[model samples]
Target: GEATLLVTFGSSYKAPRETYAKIEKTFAAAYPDQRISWTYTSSIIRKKLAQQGIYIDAPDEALEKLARLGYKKINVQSLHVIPGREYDEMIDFVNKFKAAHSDITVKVGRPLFDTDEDMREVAEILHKRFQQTIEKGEAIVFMGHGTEHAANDRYARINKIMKNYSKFMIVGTVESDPSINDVIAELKETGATAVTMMPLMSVAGDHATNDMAGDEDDSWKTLLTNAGYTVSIDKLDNGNFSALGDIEEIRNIWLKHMKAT
Candidate 1:
């Protein structure tokens, strides 16, 4: 039998566990016959979870465990939003595991923004999902957990596509360009009087909480308010903010990648 391994950069927040479960349920529905497993790419998150008495496998560990369980064919699906450092490191682990276990066969699914088609599809989904906010004359500003890796350009490219849908849609990063300053400038340029903020991340974790919506002066919420725009955070019924994976359309794109694999 084949197995599907869902790998993510694990989160310490409780709410994202529900988001992960939703993605897992979608995969299980699509591939009912195959066994499914999970692994985390971050060692620090793994360690933190372990301190809380929760144990999760690293990518290599999960693959080895799957091999030991007599699964000869494995599909590794990445839940990362971009093909950045963490995703690249997971590839290294998968490659090393394959080199050591010649008896097993492995196929990898691409990240969410892997292709031009994927980017366009995601832009359309986000635009349709937030059409109401745009209609209300509020700019929808997405906060991505950016990286120094060249793959960070994906955020800017996605922002460009978003503008094609509505001039009010903007994307910025917590750690990279298209910074908060850039977003504020775009709002001014668009003549937007209000804003809807959301996370362009797989999980609405620390970055989403503290960086995007936190009460601190440096947080996006406060910074935007200080700039004279009325800001509201796009959140779930549970009062938790929305992550990319929280949207079924986005999850389906990840599923399409796995199906292609």
Candidate 2:
């Protein structure tokens, strides 16, 4: 009678691709009888991956196929970090689908930080997990992908809650408020000599690799190092990059959303 769909803004990078694979596996294990599928909200990403022979369905396409497969109920879960423009668009797509197909009942899950409680939980998880690094007087900087959408304030709110956990923790974004320079200033004030930077995003993809940790002159690592702090970007625990979605606690946050029937 129903099926599950995990919807994401989508990515072309291997890290997120692998993260999504794990999510699919985990979700299947959680709901053994439910058929889970995926769809991307980003048309450009979907188009680009199509030319490379790694085709992922767009939201409409996946919905159509599910409906055709005789699924009367559908649950679409968003993989977005915040309730930004993309998340709004995902809701719009679902609304339209329900309007067009009156019999197909569609329900959607919230983005990662949709409510105040979500912010607190996410901040608590990150803070508790990074306790060792924070206790040593080393700072941990989280790089988020900010948006022009009003929900951009979500990052600042999360940063605020995280402050109660560790004065050495900070969150910044690539496109909007609380820029990397702002984080650099905060780090300077903390008098911390070393800092570990990681992505606050679902995947440590382009922004994490190039913008946050890249060797480019304008990268976060370069700017922080030049500003006098020893910068290590996603170089924790044997050198693999860690993203929010890759961690077990963070995965539980997403899985919790799916279980809120």
Candidate 3:
């Protein structure tokens, strides 16, 4: 794990630094032989890439800094919960780097919602999480910026596995896929009158604010209300979880991926 694995998010921040920091400390405490290193790596670098007019998606500056420290042969992983626009864009860049660099063992792992088990685990996490706030006759709708790209199959897969918790009946409205209309239909059929919306993204970016819960006429909040459900939003961002608890499932992907080989 010491071999410079570059981690990045697309639109915003996930607690990669803090999560790995706690893990590194715990790992050092228990198994001192394991050399676990992490750096502040995320979409901040990709935004800089967009700023610099870099056409190909690139690693974060923190990763570049790690590369400067002689950490080559890196495997860059995306923290996305699914294969969507941001993750698609990230893979495009990481693949290019892998192709261009002969000496680096560049690998990109799937998002937190990568597998069926992963999806079930996430359902438990989100269910237990929202349980504190969720009440009967209330619906929770997850807003995901789904992809039009062919890699978007996982969106539906993750959505399906989330059904493990029927009480929540987790519904994902993608920016590009089974949308607000989709969730509205499900909620209507369920006879639920009140709704709570949250971001299903790794980070709550523009989509969560403007598209999902914004005051705009065409936003999800508006659409849901017009459809006759009382919608509530608390501006939830996925970054608030303490460290990897926010993303332990995503991080666990690396272990599964490496072992799958």
RMSD of each: 1.2, 1.7, 5.5
lDDT of 2 at 75: 90
Q: What TM-scores do the predictions have?
A: 0.96, 0.94, 0.70
**Tens-place lDDT digits, model 2, residues 1-261:** 679999887888776788788788778887899989999778899988988899898888888889889999899988889988888888888997898889888878888898888888998888888889888999999999888899999988988888888889999998898998889888888889999988888877765678888889988889888888898766435455878887777777777886575
lDDT digits (tens) for residues 66-112 of candidate 3 = 45566555545555566556666666666665565566565555666
Residue 28, model 2: lDDT of 84
What tens-digit string does per-residue lDDT give for candidate 1 at 1-261?
A: 999999998887798988999999999998999888999778998999999998999888899999999998999999999999988888899999999999999989989998878999999998998898889788999999889999999999999988789999899998898898999988899988989998999888876688988899899999999999899999887888888999999999999998683
TM-score order, best first, reads 1, 2, 3
Candidate 3 clashing pairs, residues 3+ apart or interchain: none
Clash pairs (backbone) in predicted model 2? none
- Model 2, 110: alpha-carbon shift in Å? 0.4
- In terms of lDDT, the best-performing candidate is 1
> What is the number of residue pairs that collide in model 1?
0
